[PDB]
């Protein structure tokens, strides 16, 4: 069920505090999990920077502070098999790879669509995927569960920061065990990410 990141609920700062126009569920474009899929990551709050009332607040306020509640729903039949690791990585700095030593803006801030991994083994950051379980995470085993819920509080060296310039954390959905099925099953499995900001605070209104 629900997992609390670092065992702390998100809370208010002891500034704009929207009640229900921001606290609503945001449902992102569904990702097609296929056999050859490497994985996807989103940057927060970059994923919601241009999406609904939260998008309007994050673009017209100097400072920002919010927790998040992520639901990763998966629509698969009992005849589909595979395991996703859903990991939240605080300060997920994406690395470039060169035989281009600096990643493009499209990779650092993929937006609401999200970016695919190129080297999910090293998480595109030079750190092993095998040790990614030190970060707050949930398994989605298609034979056990098709849901992951991670509650992430605000983590920063500063009490407030810019939504547009800084991403507090990244959320990665990575197929560890590849999706596999038999001829006749749907060739893809939908993966739905639902985000709900919790305890959102804003400053510098214009």
């Amino acid at each position: 069920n629900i997992v609390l990141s670092y065992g702390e609920w998100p809370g208010y700062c002891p500034p704009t505090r929207p009640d229900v126009s921001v606290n609503r569920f945001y449902t992102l474009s569904t990702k097609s999990w296929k056999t050859e899929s490497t994985g996807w990551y989103w940057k927060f709050p970059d994923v919601l920077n241009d999406t609904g009332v939260f998008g309007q607040n994050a673009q017209f306020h100097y400072l920002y502070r919010s927790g998040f509640c992520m639901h990763v729903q998966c629509n698969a039949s009992k005849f589909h098999q595979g395991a996703l690791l859903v990991v939240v990585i605080p300060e997920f700095v994406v690395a470039a790879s060169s035989p281009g030593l600096y990643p493009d803006f499209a990779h650092t801030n993929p937006g609401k669509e999200g970016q695919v991994f190129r080297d999910p083994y090293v998480l595109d950051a030079g750190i092993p995927l095998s040790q990614a379980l030190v970060f707050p995470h949930q398994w989605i085993n298609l034979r056990t569960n098709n849901c992951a819920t991670i509650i992430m509080p605000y983590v920063n060296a500063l009490p407030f920061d810019s939504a547009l310039n800084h991403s507090n954390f990244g959320l990665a959905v990575i197929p560890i065990s590849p999706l596999k099925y038999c001829n006749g099953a749907t060739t893809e499995v939908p993966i739905t990410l639902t985000i709900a900001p919790l305890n959102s605070e804003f400053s510098g209104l214009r």
């Binding site: 395991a83 379980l133 038999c182 006749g184």
Partner: protein, 39 residues
């Protein structure tokens, strides 16, 4: 890890799967004499 029984599936089900092995220490794990790593 030994195959106690054969892998059994119904029709239209993939006949090969994966096991993910995870590892950690218990509460009685200890470390001693700091040293620099090989990598």
């Amino acid at each position: 890890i030994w195959y106690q029984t054969n892998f059994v599936v119904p029709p239209d089900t993939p006949s090969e799967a994966n096991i993910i092995a995870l590892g950690a220490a218990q509460e009685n794990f200890t470390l001693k004499l700091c040293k620099d790593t090989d990598e």
